[PDB]
Amino acid sequence: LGCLGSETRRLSLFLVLVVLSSLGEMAIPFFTGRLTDWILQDGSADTFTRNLTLMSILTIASAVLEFVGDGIYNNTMGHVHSHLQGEVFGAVLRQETEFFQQNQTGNIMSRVTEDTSTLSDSLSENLSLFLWYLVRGLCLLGIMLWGSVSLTMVTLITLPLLFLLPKKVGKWYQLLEVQVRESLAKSSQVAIEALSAMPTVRSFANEEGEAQKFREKLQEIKTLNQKEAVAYAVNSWTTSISGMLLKVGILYIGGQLVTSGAVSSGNLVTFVLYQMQFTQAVEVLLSIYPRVQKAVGSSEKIFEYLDRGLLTPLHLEGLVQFQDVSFAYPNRPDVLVLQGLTFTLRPGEVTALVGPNGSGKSTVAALLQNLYQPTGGQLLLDGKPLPQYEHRYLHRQVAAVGQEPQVFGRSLQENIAYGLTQKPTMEEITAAAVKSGAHSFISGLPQGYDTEVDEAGSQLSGGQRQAVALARALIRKPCVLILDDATSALDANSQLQVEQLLYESPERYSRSVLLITQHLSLVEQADHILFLEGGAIREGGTHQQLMEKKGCYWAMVQ
Amino acid sequence: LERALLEQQSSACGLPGSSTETRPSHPCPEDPDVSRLRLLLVVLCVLFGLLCLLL
Amino acid sequence: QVNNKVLMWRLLKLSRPDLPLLVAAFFFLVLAVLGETLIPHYSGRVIDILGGDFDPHAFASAIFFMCLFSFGSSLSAGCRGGCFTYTMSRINLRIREQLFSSLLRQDLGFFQETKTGELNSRLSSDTTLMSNWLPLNANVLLRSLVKVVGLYGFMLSISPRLTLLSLLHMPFTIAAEKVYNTRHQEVLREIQDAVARAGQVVREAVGGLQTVRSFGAEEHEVCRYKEALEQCRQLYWRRDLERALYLLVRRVLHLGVQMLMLSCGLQQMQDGELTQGSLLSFMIYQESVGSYVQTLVYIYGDMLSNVGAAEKVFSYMDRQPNLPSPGTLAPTTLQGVVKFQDVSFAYPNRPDRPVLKGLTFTLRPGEVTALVGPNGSGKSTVAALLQNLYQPTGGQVLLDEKPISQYEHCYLHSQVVSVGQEPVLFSGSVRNNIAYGLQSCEDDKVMAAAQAAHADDFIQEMEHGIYTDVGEKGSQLAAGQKQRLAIARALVRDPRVLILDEATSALDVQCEQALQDWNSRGDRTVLVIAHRLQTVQRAHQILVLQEGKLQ
């Protein structure tokens, strides 16, 4: 159920190659029997050397076709494995942000590709080995059935006796092994109980009493130990005799066949040679089936885990507004970070809405970035719904610096332009580094814009990382900008470029931005009046009006 | 599929707990002391050959 | 390197009591192998009898012998498999018993360092992986070796020309495995580098995800994953192609020597020197011997890899205990008084700062002592020093005018027993848990002790009296009942120099009154450590200390 064997063209030829290799491998015994009979009746030497030449050509061609079949199958299998790994990673990355919110689950995405890979190559092997030996075993049955029906009937009827009777007998040991293992785990639990209390046991000098207490939970196991050993002995005996006596029976009844004149000695020689082969082929196929059944039964988790806008404008209007804004975590609908909020934004201006709002400010910023759908109310920008515009145009049209910004391990020219739909100009990357003010740190690198950073940003300080992250939005040049949690932790000298951008930058006059940084120096310069906490606003008209009114904005500014 | 590692899967010649055929880890160098034993197998086959060459 | 060889010699020495079982198993294995490879020889004899004129007297005899050898082989294989499984378990039971009997003699510092879950793991796990060494691996090695010797012997018996012709490929077939392995290992390490690179890329793409969705595109990481997996598949293909090409060269060489062997056999058949049944038996041996002769090196490789998992158990077995020299003095009489002078010590797990220093102490028969000081101000360390559970680092803790470690461990534990800070009782019946470490006892003594400790009400109300079970780890009792049981377990030994650790402060004051009335009812001295001033108000004498020093 849910197979991905789509290369049915390339795979269909593997079935032709495997059957032809199997038919070609069979030359040795059959031509041994024919040639031996031919010599015993003094047949011609020409047919003898002709037969030898034919059996040599057949067995060499069998080996070559086995190799070509194995190459074609494993090339196909490697392609479908790689494709499946890519598909499951694509599917895991498409899930909603509300599933990823669980920080403790950070290893499950890190583990699903791995157990999917070990499932894939384990199932690849078992499929191959199963299919090879099933085809070999079917050909063996065929040529034995051409050989003599009455001599094969008995070797076909006897297999369930020699394969199931050991399995019936093994249940007695399996039971004794379980009872032994349980008593052993009990005895260990007594030793660990005694070891955990070491200060009291040493105080009372009971350690030779503990040695004997452990000693009795071993002497009580010896009697079961013995039973287990004799039950394995009987299992080994019965599987030995049941398999070994079949070679008496086939020889005896064959002898009778040849006495009756139904077949010659050479046919009996080929039959004795085939029987062992059939027995080994069917014996290996019984070992593979459990491993296949185990591996295939775990794939359903992966398959169900995989199963689990369009408006683009040629120019940006930059207008935005919010009304009755409510937001919450989808996993906790009984509590919300804000409700009933309202706001508006216009080109050439910027506003805070700052205050002791906690995660409610971050959820409002995630709403502006469309990282989750609004839990209550509705909003629109540039005369369109927020989800109505295409994701490629939206991500290029508006951007925000995070509250835990980081750059992935790569070259500086890669980190400063990650997610760009086209290759940025090198002069453009230099201009963005200059406009972000980080170009003084970038020019200090060993390779400038070509310099690679270490994993998780470990090659730079937190202020250097904040300066590098702030450049990414400026390189993308989105009309709407946001940035919080950086300029309050960093020095005002690092925030001086952000202060120039907010105060007088000619480029910022052609765009708009929203402030969520906790730095007080930015809060004094803000154009629009907003301040809030818990979704409740506490300022209006102007930031100067919010101070002069002596209200909650002025009390938090005190 | 060496038959000499397959027969111990069955209880005709194997022992309990022997069935898991896995190498210690993915990568691994060969020890020199086991490499010494290959030469002993070759000089054994040489001496056995020269013994049959008398016959 | 030599660490493996010395561990193998340790594992061989550990097996010496089992020599009779390993000898019987070897003897039944040799008998079973000799009795298995004879079937193809007698089967050739049957095929020779069926050609030409049939004689019943030879045919029935050959079938009877075939039955009898198959019966004798199977019986011997069954007796072997029993013997190996029994000795495997006997060495498992002994090595657990030696490991536990070695660990019980260590200092406290080893158990303060080493975690309880680690000792549980190595006691329960690695003793099994260590006992599954000699029995499994000696069996497969001896089976392969005797099978090779027997098969080449039968080949030399049947036809020396054909044996020589078969023995030709032995070297090049061995050497091909070496050359394959020594070109396969580097490709396997490069595979490990490429998959580690893909794992790094997926981990890095998960951590910054919020940034990806907010600023970038999710699909941008998908093309990076495609680029990693392309290199991964290209390397898997190159590895497996080399795997397959070696396997082709092995077979084609194998089938070529098999064909040449058959040609020479048929030519001998034309000259009449060999019979059909002989040729069948020889070619049955030819299809079999080549697996065993190849595998013998692989199983001797696994031999030298298995031993190391056992090293942790040996590392705990022979670690020298840091405890002082064994005691030799027996008092044979009352201790009288006990004293300390300039006492200093620190925990071996954090020896960078002293926990107590400069302490002098005195204790006299019939009197009491009260330790006054801040919470955690070395009081537990002073109690542990008094019970000689850890060696003193400075000063002397001499008692009855003799060194604290000079008295025998049994006599010291029997005379100086002290009630712990928190009650603990091992799992079992109350009639065993109330007298742990007593060499012998009577139920009348325990019943008197329970009455003396005011525990008799709880003991008489039980489902079997004193014979009732106390549950796992003492969890099947009240906390006040646990303190009463601990007080009885201290008094049942009749100590001459007892101690208290403030347990009666949370407990009933009736327990403290019973302890003061009963333990102080004669020459026996007692000392108590507590933070509550109510104990110091009832005490006949007191001693103050702070910051690790007396005050």
Side-chain angles (χ1 to χ4, degrees), chain A residues 1-309 313 318 328 330 333 340 347-348 352 355-356 358 360 365-366 374 376-377 383 385 387 399-400 402 405 409 417 419 424 431-433 437-438 444 446 448 456-457 462-463 467 469 471 473 478 486 489 492 506 526 534-536 540-541 551 555, chain B, chain C residues 1-321 324 326-327 330-331 336 346 348 351 354 358 365-366 370 373-374 376 378 383-384 392 394-395 403 420 423 428 435 437 448-450 452-453 455 465 471 474 478-480 486 488 490 495 503 506 514 522 530 539 548:
Chain A
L1 298 180
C3 183
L4 187 50
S6 182
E7 304 302 333
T8 61
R9 300 192 72 171
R10 210 176 280 273
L11 186 68
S12 59
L13 184 62
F14 176 62
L15 271 294
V16 174
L17 265 290
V18 71
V19 304
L20 264 289
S21 78
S22 163
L23 267 297
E25 182 170 47
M26 298 321 302
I28 290 159
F30 165 77
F31 281 96
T32 293
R34 277 191 71 265
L35 288 179
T36 311
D37 209 354
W38 194 247
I39 283 291
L40 202 69
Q41 322 314 332
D42 298 322
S44 74
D46 47 40
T47 57
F48 158 79
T49 183
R50 198 271 282 267
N51 288 346
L52 278 168
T53 305
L54 176 57
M55 67 174 282
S56 176
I57 286 169
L58 289 177
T59 188
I60 295 297
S62 176
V64 174
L65 295 191
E66 172 168 295
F67 163 81
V68 170
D70 288 342
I72 290 294
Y73 172 91
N74 287 287
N75 205 277
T76 294
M77 193 54 53
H79 271 294
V80 63
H81 165 95
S82 168
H83 179 73
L84 178 146
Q85 270 286 326
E87 254 193 342
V88 67
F89 176 66
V92 76
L93 196 64
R94 287 191 304 265
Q95 300 318 286
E96 298 79 11
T97 53
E98 75 202 60
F99 174 55
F100 290 106
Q101 81 172 12
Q102 274 68 232
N103 62 286
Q104 79 277 38
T105 61
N107 76 336
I108 79 177
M109 302 72 72
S110 198
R111 181 177 181 170
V112 290
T113 53
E114 293 177 350
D115 72 348
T116 304
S117 76
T118 198
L119 176 140
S120 177
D121 57 26
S122 180
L123 182 154
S124 158
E125 156 50 25
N126 292 12
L127 149 63
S128 171
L129 205 66
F130 175 85
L131 190 54
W132 261 110
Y133 276 87
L134 185 148
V135 168
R136 293 182 183 174
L138 278 180
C139 179
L140 290 183
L141 173 64
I143 306 301
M144 295 172 77
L145 196 58
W146 180 17
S148 45
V149 59
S150 300
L151 191 55
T152 198
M153 164 175 68
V154 56
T155 199
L156 209 60
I157 288 295
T158 296
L159 306 184
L161 181 164
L162 75 93
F163 286 119
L164 301 179
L165 193 70
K167 197 177 300 296
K168 183 268 186 178
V169 168
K171 285 173 68 76
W172 177 31
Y173 163 88
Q174 293 286 5
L175 185 148
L176 287 187
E177 158 58 18
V178 165
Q179 296 194 0
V180 163
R181 196 192 299 188
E182 288 306 299
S183 301
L184 194 64
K186 174 182 309 296
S187 74
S188 170
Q189 194 77 280
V190 171
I192 296 301
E193 183 202 322
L195 281 159
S196 186
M198 190 56 54
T200 173
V201 296
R202 182 57 57 85
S203 176
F204 297 130
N206 196 32
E207 65 268 39
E208 67 187 320
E210 291 307 332
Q212 181 161 5
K213 277 276 191 71
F214 187 65
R215 183 170 294 107
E216 307 305 344
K217 306 302 186 183
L218 268 49
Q219 296 301 338
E220 190 151 42
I221 285 177
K222 171 189 303 292
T223 308
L224 194 67
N225 223 325
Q226 214 72 73
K227 297 149 144 80
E228 220 200 304
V230 79
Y232 192 84
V234 164
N235 186 297
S236 172
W237 174 81
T238 195
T239 192
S240 175
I241 184 66
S242 174
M244 191 167 289
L245 207 65
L246 175 56
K247 268 160 289 184
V248 154
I250 191 166
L251 266 174
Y252 172 80
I253 199 67
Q256 294 300 320
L257 290 155
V258 61
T259 323
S260 187
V263 287
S264 82
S265 310
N267 308 131
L268 191 52
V269 170
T270 57
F271 209 102
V272 168
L273 277 160
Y274 289 152
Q275 197 293 329
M276 288 160 41
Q277 293 195 297
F278 177 31
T279 303
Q280 296 316 130
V282 72
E283 183 168 67
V284 179
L285 181 146
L286 277 171
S287 176
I288 303 311
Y289 162 67
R291 310 198 319 173
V292 176
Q293 200 78 355
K294 166 163 59 178
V296 300
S298 302
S299 81
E300 187 169 56
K301 176 172 65 77
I302 308 167
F303 181 89
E304 293 200 338
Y305 192 66
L306 171 144
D307 194 25
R308 183 178 183 168
Chain B
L1 281 63
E2 286 296 342
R3 290 173 66 166
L5 299 177
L6 177 63
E7 291 182 315
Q8 303 86 346
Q9 297 297 344
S10 72
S11 57
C13 311
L15 293 170
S18 65
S19 60
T20 305
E21 289 293 345
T22 54
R23 291 292 177 264
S25 43
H26 300 291
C28 55
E30 196 188 308
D31 293 286
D33 305 330
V34 65
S35 313
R36 302 298 292 175
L37 174 148
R38 278 155 171 174
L39 266 61
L40 172 64
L41 296 188
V42 180
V43 298
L44 168 68
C45 295
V46 164
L47 176 61
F48 197 102
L50 300 169
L51 178 149
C52 305
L53 194 57
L54 309 179
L55 303 173
Chain C
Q1 316 88 338
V2 83
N3 61 296
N4 293 339
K5 188 167 173 63
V6 302
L7 287 173
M8 285 199 293
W9 181 240
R10 293 182 183 174
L11 290 177
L12 290 165
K13 281 184 58 175
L14 177 63
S15 194
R16 185 170 180 148
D18 283 80
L19 283 169
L21 289 192
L22 292 176
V23 168
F26 160 87
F27 204 89
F28 288 133
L29 175 62
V30 167
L31 180 59
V33 167
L34 175 154
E36 161 177 295
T37 71
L38 211 76
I39 279 178
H41 163 236
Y42 259 79
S43 303
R45 189 61 42 62
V46 161
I47 293 295
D48 194 18
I49 289 163
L50 290 168
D53 182 33
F54 174 79
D55 172 17
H57 309 301
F59 177 72
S61 180
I63 291 297
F64 172 76
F65 271 103
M66 202 163 290
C67 300
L68 207 78
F69 286 119
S70 76
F71 176 91
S73 171
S74 298
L75 183 148
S76 61
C79 291
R80 178 222 66 163
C83 281
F84 269 127
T85 307
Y86 185 36
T87 183
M88 185 197 308
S89 82
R90 298 179 84 247
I91 71 178
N92 197 335
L93 269 55
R94 182 154 65 255
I95 192 53
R96 286 169 183 259
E97 210 280 346
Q98 289 178 359
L99 177 60
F100 185 74
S101 189
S102 188
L103 287 161
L104 290 185
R105 298 165 214 285
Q106 300 293 326
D107 61 275
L108 310 179
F110 173 84
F111 297 104
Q112 189 67 274
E113 179 261 350
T114 285
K115 332 319 317 177
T116 305
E118 213 282 322
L119 284 163
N120 169 34
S121 182
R122 300 288 182 268
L123 175 61
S124 306
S125 168
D126 310 80
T127 62
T128 293
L129 275 165
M130 175 160 51
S131 289
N132 294 1
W133 185 77
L134 184 68
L136 268 60
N137 290 296
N139 164 285
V140 52
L141 177 68
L142 262 291
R143 175 151 193 279
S144 181
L145 177 64
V146 72
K147 189 70 79 88
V148 164
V149 174
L151 272 277
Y152 267 95
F154 281 114
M155 290 183 165
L156 180 60
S157 164
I158 296 293
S159 288
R161 292 177 64 84
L162 306 181
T163 301
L164 173 58
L165 201 55
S166 175
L167 165 62
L168 311 178
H169 65 265
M170 294 300 293
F172 305 107
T173 314
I174 288 170
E177 193 283 317
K178 183 178 179 180
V179 179
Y180 165 65
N181 189 327
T182 205
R183 181 177 181 170
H184 185 243
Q185 290 306 332
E186 313 98 297
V187 184
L188 188 54
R189 183 180 65 255
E190 194 168 326
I191 281 283
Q192 189 63 42
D193 178 78
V195 71
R197 183 170 294 107
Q200 167 58 12
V201 170
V202 67
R203 187 186 68 87
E204 187 78 323
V206 161
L209 82 169
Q210 301 306 136
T211 79
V212 179
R213 299 179 81 112
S214 185
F215 184 39
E218 309 96 309
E219 269 64 35
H220 199 71
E221 300 305 314
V222 179
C223 77
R224 196 91 72 84
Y225 205 61
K226 295 305 212 299
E227 185 40 42
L229 269 292
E230 172 54 12
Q231 308 285 349
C232 188
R233 181 192 58 83
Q234 288 282 5
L235 199 60
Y236 270 122
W237 163 242
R238 183 178 296 163
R239 180 204 76 172
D240 196 44
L241 176 146
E242 194 65 9
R243 182 179 180 274
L245 200 72
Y246 164 56
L247 196 146
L248 164 64
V249 163
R250 162 196 287 223
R251 186 182 295 276
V252 74
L253 168 158
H254 182 197
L255 296 167
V257 68
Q258 194 292 329
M259 185 289 301
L260 179 57
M261 188 289 293
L262 181 68
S263 167
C264 191
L266 263 289
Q267 196 288 321
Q268 289 162 205
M269 195 93 180
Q270 183 65 260
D271 294 341
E273 293 198 311
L274 201 62
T275 69
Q276 160 165 244
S278 297
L279 186 144
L280 169 58
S281 69
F282 182 97
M283 170 163 94
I284 282 292
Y285 298 149
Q286 183 55 28
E287 299 286 52
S288 184
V289 81
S291 170
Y292 300 103
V293 78
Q294 182 281 353
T295 205
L296 187 148
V297 309
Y298 264 23
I299 197 71
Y300 201 102
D302 213 29
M303 181 86 151
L304 298 186
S305 193
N306 186 340
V307 61
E311 68 179 330
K312 297 302 301 184
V313 182
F314 287 105
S315 80
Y316 293 122
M317 278 265 283
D318 68 25
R319 181 179 180 274
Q320 171 62 45

